[PDB]
Symmetry: C4
Subunit: 390 residues, 4 copies
């Protein structure tokens, strides 16, 4: 019989390495006979036995004749799909969980919870599934596009925690946290602090008592807002990441934002979902982050790390760990997830690599995975190997 | 070991919402590489661990060369098929249960029961299959196209109840109920009351004591015949629904059929199978129905609910719960099924959205899913997104 | 924990009915995107939990460019493949058990045994697999094409019995029986009686003590040789089926072979594998057989039945049960198999329907299934629905 | 719960026979609708319930547009993949374990261990994965293409032994052995003796005490270096095989290398990985090897055996056990693996049959399987049946 699940100490290791590429569109050419789903916003969640690869499909394959509109975001056809990690997400392999143009998922130890937001922009609806059953919803509270993590949610003792948000992308977007248990919302958590704009949060456990998320401010700053959730007291505070190594895109030169830690600075309009995962140690806490190689475009992806301290107060640059994606390749969304080993947890970062040929062709993505493994320096970058002309 | 299942209290919730679209022909294009089966009359039936998506195929794929005939109903090629709900029903994903040009299925908590009618129009044969084995048959009794539900049948305590009917579709078709147990028919129940013409009943549990069916008079009325089946005494009775919200298609204007409740009215000729599903609470029962948005065409699909009362006597209009399919998309057969959550049941409605381009091109169908979830109003509607020309 | 398996009493029923068609080539057209394996000699075997559909593929799909040679029999590419019954045997769905141009399989209650013969004609080799492991072989003893049942073998108390044979197709072919236990040959059984030519035997249990097979004489008679295996004493006798209803193809007019029961008669050169399954009752034994509608070509397929008596001595015509395949459709190999219901066994007959366009096109087959179900007369025939020009 | 596995006595048997052909490119034609992966360096590794078929893909299918590069070895796209043995390794059937341009895997009785080396030629990285989790890494030690077995590694009592090597392939490559446990490297074993150049060892258990490896000197000899690894003391020693039946390709004429056993000889430059597998009896051990039928080209594959004796000292020619691939078909890499039967182990040899049409067309491979089964001589040989022009 299955127990609830808890964050365990991390596995030993001092560096990340290239783990695995999932590039479906290597098989999307017209010469071929394969049918990979057009997707975006991939993310991964692992339970005690499998890891699932999730995405939002446009309900189209390549090749096909429904490309037109695949470079949009919300519509009545977007679905949350998954396959077992390491399987190519195709028409036959994928499972379609629910209609949703925004999503999340997480395993509590007994069951999968699936999260999908759909509906009209002025009144969207967060839906929840526990296994195969629809169990609860949540309503827009700002009437300006309710949306969620695009990342794994996080469960502890059967309590699953989920960031949601609502409000103008180019203005105020106050996020809330949901406390979900066996598919049903049992508490809403309103953060305090710097709440102006928080979205597309990437959250993991820093401890058995705290969740941390690095988030996106699409409006005011290239600093990432940084949430701290206290799971023992069901309360949350958000302050900007003080680090000179600004993690959003677009962004100014590192350390060029003058003033106190909460200062917004410039080139802070727009943003990108960023990767963040915890290395939990006995007397240490490892914080691993990812950001675009370009300060302006979605190209390349870098790995950064900082042990200990307070991300709210420390202005120190993050340590640069290595190049995961070269600047000559697309570097879009990235996310954190952990694989459950037998006795310990393995932290990993995934990378969405979008094939963008403009609005006059199909628009989709591959997923690069990096994971904490062994000692040394990160050794090799990743390429999609896709030529969109085929 | 497993035990027999019984209807449970429904899960908490106040409105339906868009769950899931299964739209195989989104990958049905010449430009592509997939092979979705040409099907019609879909329905869903869920068990303690799996929900299954059934349909009647024509034993052809799109694209393919065997379109001719796919706009017909009965032939030697038709087979009851299924995929796990959420999977695209393609040549490879599908499983072929039996030859059938009319079907049903249901889980008793121990095993799947599958039901398929095939054979000549003047001597059809209902076949029962329990798991992998074929176990019993029922004979035509009117020699006018013996036929069954096209929706999930209903199992309580190992006993599965099923509507069957036989007769001219422009005249009399007195239906019967079969009591099946572990694949074998143990009692025929002959309903009393308004028996002139019943078919394509959508049935579900109103309690541990009563099964209710909303049906189709293809001959005499636009009101749906409404079966109450007492499961304790194995007796059944039919009267027409009194509600001014007439549920068949075609139909006249709401509340325009004058006279006592049993009055047939104008626009009786013709019909369509309608969604019906139960919401079982503490000491009240909600009844959820679906009808096409057009009075005469198979376009659109609206949701309606009515808590309590006797459906044989309540002239009251049903409450309009929302638009599931717009008047600009096809709305064909609809059906009710329930999903099993950990401790309670989730009431759902499925809509068949047929792609119809005439007898000179392929003729298949998508399936839209709406389920009780959360509170509020029903928000978004469903399109199939299919271009029948691609 | 699993027990060994034994023949149980049959399920009640007095007639066969059309159960299920598996016609992969409905999806083989060039307009399509599917890839069904080119196969022949299909057969089915069921264990306590699933039923597997077996065949010998030419290691080619349709469409493709390896048709040339698919109208042959033995080569270094022929394999024994299977899928779960009701699944279309395609390149992806099928599993490849072993190289073999002749085969058999059966479940003992704990495990699958697979049988495949390959090698050169003058020295072929019978191979055995127990689950995934190759466990034993058997050698040609006549150097003239060692070959086997093309049908399910039969297990009792963990002992699986298998017909094999060797020798000229147009001359003498003395069959032997193998006693196999957990993948290894533990006894060879040499029949006595009329041993001149016995091949492609279709065997089932007539009792907990006897196996009966109806076989093919390709050389001397259109009567089917009829084996009786005694499982309590590991001994076997073969005599010709005395019945006027000659079951082989080609064949003379019924009852036209004058003389004693063992008389060969004419039109007895050549032959066809014929279907045969037992209806085991308390005080009765049902023997169900199938034979071509044509007396000369492989067209149509008929169902016959006789209760009780001695098939060695009785000259009475078999009772005609109905037309399974019309004479306007191909009727090639047929076979018997039983599905295990919960408390009882269900007898069924399968029919190989070859698409034969000559040697200048592909050459493959679909499988029609009929099964004992309910009372009355067999109601409907089967068609492949395939146009080989597509 | 499961327990650790140990080598068991082999099953009874005296000769190998043709088991199974996996030839994906039989469905690789333009005329068709399949998508087999372009792979090379296959190998098999079996566990207590499943046997897995591994390969290194180039992340492309046939037909497809990414042929260019598929005749190379190392690039960022290469991934270790697998299907259950008997399944066609296509885009949909496959699972992508990790990025790797050199690989291995093995089961300890509790879990799969997967091994993949990727990275720059001058700083490769071996990655260890235990089930779903990445668990450890090993670094280049010569900065000359760290690389591993390309065959199953070897687990006894939870300890998995693996050969790795690093060095110029036209010079020195002193190999090492890694002792892995539950994904983690717990000891490096540095072999003594003839260490000049070892690589691509094919390893297997000779007893509960000793692992034996037949390897490849790509530089100095056509004799195979032969590792004896004592598993009790974790020490290893290498000397060359003395047998006149030299096993590398290219090679000179048998018994033409004159001198003591350690003598290198002519035609040392170049090499190929060879099949090697153990047959463990009461108190004797058979050693089965494979070598290409041509002295200089990668054509054909023959089987050889030698019961007992010391392979470091036995000048005796090995007994020729048969032709598996004719001199008219490709014979590339070969490898040994064992299948687990109920109470004993089944020794097997796998052959890589590469389809080579030059650097201007696709470059992939089939896999032939031979296993110990029954007695006699080895009968039939294997073709792949592929036309590289289709
Ligand atoms: C239609 O009819 C069926 C059959 O009667 C009803 O199903 C039963 O529903 C009741 C609840 O109404 C169930 O009783 C409960 O069982 C709980 C344990 O879960 C399992 O229990 C056994 C094994 O322990 C299993 O065999 C079974 O399948 C259950 O899944 C108990 O924990 C509960 O007891 C607690 O609750 C109350 C106080 O709140 C008290 O009884 C106790 O003091 C205790 O605190 C509870 O008794 C019963 O198990 C169900 N049986 C079956 C076969 O399903 C349907 O509810 C009914 N539908 C209606 C009425 O709409
Ligand atoms: C390499 O090393 C391993 C570990 O020592 C050996 O594996 C053992 O092999 C022996 C046989 O040589 C096994 O002993 C036998 O166990 C049988 C039962 O099967 C299971 O037993 C237990 C549970 O009962 C399980 O834990 C285990 O995994 C087995 O699968 C017994 O029935 C046998 O006993 C009978 O046989 C003889 C007489 O013939 C007597 O011992 C008894 O009187 C009795 O009649 C038998 O003892 C042992 O279980 C194996 N262990 C493991 C962990 O696998 C390998 O054989 C060895 N390889 C070599 C030597 O080549
Ligand atoms: C916070 O989450 C739980 C809080 O209890 C921690 O998990 C638990 O960890 C303990 C020990 O780490 C486990 O207890 C036992 O440990 C002994 C060794 O002393 C061992 O022999 C037993 O077999 C047993 O495992 C306990 O089972 C485990 N529970 C679960 C559900 O995992 C967790 O480590 C904490 N997270 C941290 C510290 O980051
Ligand atoms: C020949 O095969 C076996 C020979 O024993 C028969 O199967 C066995 O049948 C008996 C009864 O049919 C089963 O015993 C028990 O029956 C009682 C009822 O009296 C029931 O309450 C028990 O639960 C139990 O089932 C026995 O279990 C069963 N064994 C197996 C392995 O199936 C079989 O019926 C014979 N075949 C014939 C007669 O055709
Ligand atoms: C809706 C606001 C938000 C910020 C602009 O848009 C996101 C940015 C997009 C992006 O930056 O690539 C992709 C996301 N799919 C989108 N989210 C939704 C719900 O549409
Ligand atoms: C045969 C009577 C019945 C009522 C008109 O026909 C149904 C009409 C249906 C319809 O109105 O679309 C299609 C159904 N598939 C068909 N059922 C059968 C068994 O043919
Ligand atoms: C080899 C003798 C036998 C009788 C002519 O041939 C069978 C007849 C063929 C047939 O009658 O259709 C098909 C069988 N695949 C074949 N068996 C083998 C092993 O090739
Ligand atoms: C790099 C040294 C080694 C020996 C020549 O190369 C091998 C030659 C092999 C060969 O001879 O065909 C192909 C192997 N895939 C390759 N291995 C790697 C890691 O590239
Ligand atoms: C459809 O089939 C009928 C016969 O069944 C045939 O007469 C008709 O021409 C076919 N239609 C087309 C468009 O080919
Ligand atoms: C293969 O790729 C190289 C560059 O990587 C390119 O120069 C060459 O032309 C390509 N070959 C073909 C046949 O296109
Ligand atoms: C698709 O783009 C076309 C241009 O090809 C444009 O006319 C239209 O806005 C879009 N239509 C749909 C259905 O997406
Ligand atoms: C296939 O048939 C061709 C004719 O197209 C003939 O030349 C030859 O005998 C056959 N070849 C193979 C490889 O089967
Ligand atoms: Ca920003
Ligand atoms: Ca009507
Ligand atoms: Ca004959
Ligand atoms: Ca050499």
């Amino acid at each position: 019989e299955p127990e609830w699940t808890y964050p365990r100490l991390s596995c030993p290791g001092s560096t990340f390495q290239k783990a695995l590429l999932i590039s479906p569109h290597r098989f999307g050419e017209t010469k071929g006979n394969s049918a990979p789903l057009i997707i975006r916003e991939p993310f991964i969640a692992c339970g005690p036995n499998e890891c699932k690869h999730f995405a939002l499909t446009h309900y189209a394959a390549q090749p096909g004749g429904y490309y037109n509109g695949t470079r949009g975001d919300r519509n009545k056809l977007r679905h949350l799909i998954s396959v077992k990690l390491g399987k190519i997400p195709t028409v036959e392999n994928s499972i379609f969980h629910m209609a949703a143009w925004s999503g999340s998922a997480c395993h509590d130890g007994k069951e999968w919870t699936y999260i999908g937001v759909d509906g009209p922009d002025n009144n969207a609806l967060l839906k929840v599934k526990y296994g195969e059953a629809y169990t609860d919803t949540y309503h827009s509270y700002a009437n300006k596009i309710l949306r969620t993590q695009e990342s794994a949610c996080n469960c502890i003792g059967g309590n699953c925690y989920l960031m949601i948000t609502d409000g103008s992308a180019s203005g105020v977007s106050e996020c809330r946290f949901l406390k979900i248990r066996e598919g049903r919302i049992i508490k809403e958590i309103f953060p305090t602090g710097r709440v102006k704009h928080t979205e597309e949060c990437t959250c993991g456990f820093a401890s058995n008592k705290t969740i941390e998320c690095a988030c996106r401010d699409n409006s005011y700053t290239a600093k990432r807002p940084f949430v701290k959730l206290n799971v023992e007291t069901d309360t949350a505070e958000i302050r900007l990441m003080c680090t000179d190594t600004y993690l959003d895109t677009p962004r100014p030169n590192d350390g060029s934002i003058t003033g106190p830690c909460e200062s917004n600075g410039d080139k802070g309009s727009g943003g990108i979902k960023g990767g963040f995962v915890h290395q939990r140690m006995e007397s240490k806490i490892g914080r691993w982050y990812s950001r675009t190689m370009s300060k302006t475009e979605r190209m390349g992806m870098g790995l950064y790390v900082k042990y200990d301290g307070d991300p709210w107060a420390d202005s120190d640059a993050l340590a640069f760990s290595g190049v995961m994606v070269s600047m000559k390749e697309p570097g879009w969304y990235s996310f954190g997830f952990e694989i459950k080993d037998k006795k310990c947890d393995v932290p990993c970062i995934g990378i969405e690599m979008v094939h963008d040929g403009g609005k006059e062709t199909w628009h989709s993505a591959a997923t690069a995975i990096y994971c904490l493994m062994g000692s040394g320096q990160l050794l090799w970058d990743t390429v999609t190997g896709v030529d969109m002309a085929l």
